[PDB]
Write a protein that binds this DNA or RNA. Structure first.
Lengths: 60, 113, 53, 86, 122, 138, 177
RNA sequence: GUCGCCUCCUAAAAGGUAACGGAGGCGCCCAAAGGUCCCCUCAGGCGGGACGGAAAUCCGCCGGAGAGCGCAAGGGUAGAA
RNA sequence: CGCUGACUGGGGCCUGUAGAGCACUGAUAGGGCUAGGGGGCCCACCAGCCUACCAAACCCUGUCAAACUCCGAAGGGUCCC
RNA sequence: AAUCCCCCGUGCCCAUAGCGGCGUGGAACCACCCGUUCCCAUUCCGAACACGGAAGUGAAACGCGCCAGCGCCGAUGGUACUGGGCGGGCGACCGCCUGGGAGAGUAGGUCGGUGCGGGGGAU
């Protein structure tokens, strides 16, 4: 159940529409914060696309 | 042209005309030497050798009768299956006097048309 | 309509009396006093139908 | 009191062609595929086209409608498994 | 098989046509297969500009009929030479032609596998 | 890349007016030639010309071949002033797609023609690349 | 001559000193090897104009070399080649050159010259059987003359994977005839 | 100059967008291009003969229909409109 | 009203620019084969003759297109999970 | 009558079935064929459509096979273009990082593959 642990970086300030949603989606409130999830290609996708967005970590 | 637009003679599409609906492609394939028809009905349907000149030998009554019967019977064979109202199939040439013949078959055959 | 004495002339046609009429556009172009066809006035149904008007 | 020349300048107006309902959705006895009105609908989906194969619309009811040549008038039925006994 | 290539009639026309009414009626009496076709063009090489008129006369006649004609009509023509054209066939006179009929002729009639008639059979 | 109104409504179907292709002489191996790297609606005229002056200085054997040719064109001042601009044509050429097979100084041993083309580059306009072909130049 | 590689790495490979180049042969291929340095030398000789081969693991020392490729890129420095051998007695697709001399006819007297849209000659003689350098020049040149396929004049191996009358090599006015 | 409406291109590939940006058509008509039932296989090129030497008319071969459809384009499409 | 929404993963079905491509079309170059105009020669109704100048069309070597495309992705769409 | 070989009606896959070169089949099959008063029928003739019937024939359409010349199909490694991310040059533009990745271009592949029924051909 590869549990994913991402953080916040490079404010999406003014950056692509959607991209943001992928923000509020994955669950992204305040800045430079850390959240985690299951691999799930879903959640996965989003995040990834967000790529440069911040940082992903394989945790649990 | 597309396969059916460079050769010539057929009209298959004047078959698809009845295809739309009405009942079985009471299609009647001819070849003088004799007459042979099936029953292509919609849905990758099939047939039931309803009437053929050989099925019951080819007799010795030429055109006339042949048909007269081949049909009738045919019509007989089918209405045993569970059809009822079947659409005609000029298969080819113009409802020639043959044709017309067979035709009779069906009709007389009680298989409405 | 746009009444244009140009081979373009609008006309109708009675129903032997079937009573009234029914719409139609025309053109002297050919066959002048020519104009017949059947329909069905409130009068039963069908009925010969001259067109002239 | 007339109009001029050597000014080609001649904007064009509007249309509104589509595939409405695209391929394989909730089928409703209504405007099937469109790109030629006066159209003459057909039965179920359509697969005939200046392309080769065919197209299914896992959606079945009364009928749909054509577009005059394009797409490819319907006829290759295809009610859909969602048309059996309740 | 020398029972092949070895000939057996095949068509054979004989006609005429003037920038024109009836002259073809002199045509009907000599045979029995009236030709009714429309020549044309649009110039003044004879006063034939009219590009859509009925002047072309052509009394088709292969087999059977042609026979009676090849017959009662083959005596008054005096030549027998040159007038012999490639495509096994030839045309003389006020307008008449006839085509050969080697064994590999017909096929050229099929809508399908229309063998462009090989040049060793014809 | 603004281009024209159509190949037969505005200005399309011409000869473009120029001085044909081939010159110099044959040659099986010796690969002597010229190409570029610059992008530019190659200045027709300028073009036509150029190449030519090329022959002007040589004469005979050296594939004075040349693989170019404009075929579309610009437009500007004609009518009112500056606003709603109709169009008056003038000056067709062809896009020198960021480098490519220009013209060829092709022949056995005849640099007396290499220098030529050379003189041919000098000219031209958009810089140009001096080069050889499969093998080089002998 | 040598050239190695065949894993799955084109970018870096396609970079530095090693240029891609598939191991092509009737029936089988194998990751691209070779190198951007060998291509040089050899290629420099006369790619599909003679033929050799390299020893990679002594594997299969065979000929056929290149039947395609390109210095493509703008720069004019190839990258990503094709390689196919032929240990068979079927060798067809054989395109080897053909040279004249200078026979004086339209040139050293008429200044006139001659185009040679030909030069090469993709034919198919006696498989694994061709003179890396075949010459044929019956001479002739000047005025509005021209020679091409048809005439030609083929020695031994009777192929011609080609046709008659077509881009042979004529004589045109380097100025005027 | 120009304002309505029909098509192309512009629209970046769902749909759809300026420009006094490109080019071109319409304010008709056809009583029979109407409805069906029944039949047809184009242009063209080549080869052979009247009046015919472009350019017919017939006869014999070759043909993803390039002819065909009152009108502008574009889609269609002989199975055929 | 209450998990339906932007967004992502999956699955069909579509559009067909960029690119590329020459058999549709319109260019366009080097050339071969050829008949149209030449052109010089028997004086030339000769319509017989050779060949260095212009060409049409078919063939090879090549190349440009928004109102070209047998080819075709980036991607966007839309219903469902 | 509930297995293969063949021919015949005939369907799907819209050329890996088309072109064409040679060939083979007629006991069975099928056509060509033999005639034309009446059904119907040619703007001209029963050529095609058409009714009746042996002999004759496999020539022709046709069916199975062999042949790559024309076609049609068509990979791998490969280059353009580009969704996304970030750098260089005032410059038309160049490059990098990450997933997508064609046509043409050599290999080669093709001379259909497969449904249902009818006649037989295999006690």
């Amino acid at each position: 159940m590869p549990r994913l642990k991402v953080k916040l970086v490079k404010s999406p300030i003014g950056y692509p529409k959607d991209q943001k949603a992928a923000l509020k989606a994955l669950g992204l409130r305040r800045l430079q914060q850390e959240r985690v999830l299951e691999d799930t290609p879903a959640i996965r996708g989003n995040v990834e696309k967000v790529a440069h967005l911040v940082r992903v970590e394989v945790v649990e | 042209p597309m396969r059916r637009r460079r050769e010539a003679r057929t009209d298959y599409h004047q078959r698809l005309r009845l295809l739309k609906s009405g009942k079985p492609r009471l299609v009647a394939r001819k070849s003088n030497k004799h007459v042979r028809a099936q029953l292509v009905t919609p849905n990758g349907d099939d047939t039931l050798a309803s009437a053929h000149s050989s099925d019951l030998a080819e007799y010795g009554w030429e055109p006339t009768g042949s048909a007269y019967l081949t049909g009738l019977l045919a019509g007989l064979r089918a209405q045993e299956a569970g059809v009822e109202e079947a659409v005609l199939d000029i298969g080819l040439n113009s409802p020639t006097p043959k044709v017309f013949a067979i035709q009779e078959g069906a009709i007389d055959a009680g298989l409405d048309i | 309509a746009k009444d244009g004495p140009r081979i373009i002339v609008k006309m109708e046609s009675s129903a032997g009396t079937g009573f009234y009429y029914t719409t139609t556009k025309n053109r002297r172009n050919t066959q002048a006093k020519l104009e017949l066809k059947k329909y069905d006035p409130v009068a039963k149904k069908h009925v010969v139908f001259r067109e002239k008007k | 009191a007339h109009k001029k020349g050597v000014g080609s300048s001649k904007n064009g107006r509007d249309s509104n062609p589509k595939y409405l309902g695209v391929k394989k959705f909730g089928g409703e006895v209504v405007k099937a595929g469109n790109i030629l009105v006066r159209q003459r609908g057909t039965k179920f989906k359509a697969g005939q086209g200046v392309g080769m194969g065919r197209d299914h619309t896992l959606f079945a009811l009364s009928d749909g409608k054509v577009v005059f040549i394009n797409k490819g008038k319907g006829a290759r039925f295809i009610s859909i498994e969602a048309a059996q006994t309740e | 098989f020398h029972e092949m290539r070895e000939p057996r009639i095949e068509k054979v026309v004989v006609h005429m046509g003037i920038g024109h009414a009836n002259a073809e009626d002199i045509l009907g009496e000599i045979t029995g297969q009236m030709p009714v076709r429309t020549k044309a063009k649009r110039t003044v090489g004879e006063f034939d500009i009219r590009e859509g008129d009925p002047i072309g006369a052509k009394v088709t006649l292969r087999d059977e009929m042609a026979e009676e004609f090849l017959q009662t009509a083959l005596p008054l023509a005096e030549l027998a030479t040159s007038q012999f054209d490639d495509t096994g066939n030839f045309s003389f006179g006020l307008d008449v032609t006839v085509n050969l009929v080697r064994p590999g002729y017909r096929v050229a009639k099929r809508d399908k596998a229309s063998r462009s008639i090989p040049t060793k059979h014809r | 890349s603004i281009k024209p109104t159509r190949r037969e409504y505005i200005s399309g179907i011409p000869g473009k007016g120029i001085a044909q292709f081939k010159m110099g002489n044959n040659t099986y191996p010796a690969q002597v030639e010229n190409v570029v790297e610059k992008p530019v609606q190659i200045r027709h005229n300028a073009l036509e010309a150029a190449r030519n002056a090329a022959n002007r200085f040589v004469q005979n054997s050296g594939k004075f071949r040349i693989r170019k040719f404009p075929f579309h064109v610009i437009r500007e001042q004609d009518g009112d002033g500056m606003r709603a601009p109709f169009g008056k044509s003038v000056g067709t050429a062809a896009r020198s797609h960021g480098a490519n097979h220009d013209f060829i100084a092709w022949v056995n041993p005849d640099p007396a023609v290499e220098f030529a083309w050379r003189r041919a580059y000098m000219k031209v306009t958009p810089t140009v690349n001096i080069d050889s072909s499969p093998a080089g130049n002998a | 001559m040598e050239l190695t590689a065949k894993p799955r790495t084109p970018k870096q490979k396609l970079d530095e000193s090693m240029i891609a180049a598939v191991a092509y042969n009737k029936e089988n291929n194998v990751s691209f090897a070779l190198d951007r340095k060998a291509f040089d030398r050899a290629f420099r000789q006369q790619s599909t104009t003679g033929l050799f081969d390299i020893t990679v693991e002594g594997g299969e020392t065979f000929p056929a070399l290149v039947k395609a490729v390109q210095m493509d890129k703008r720069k004019r420095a190839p990258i990503h080649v094709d390689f196919y051998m032929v240990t068979y007695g079927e060798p067809v697709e054989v395109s080897v050159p053909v040279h004249t001399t200078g026979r004086s006819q339209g040139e050293v007297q008429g200044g006139l010259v001659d185009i040679v849209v030909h030069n090469l000659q993709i034919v198919a003689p006696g498989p694994r059987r061709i003179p890396q350098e075949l010459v044929v020049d019956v001479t002739k040149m000047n005025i509005g003359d021209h020679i091409t396929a048809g005439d030609i004049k083929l020695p031994e191996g009777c192929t011609l994977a080609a046709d008659p009358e077509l881009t042979v090599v004529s004589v045109l006015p380097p100025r005027l005839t």
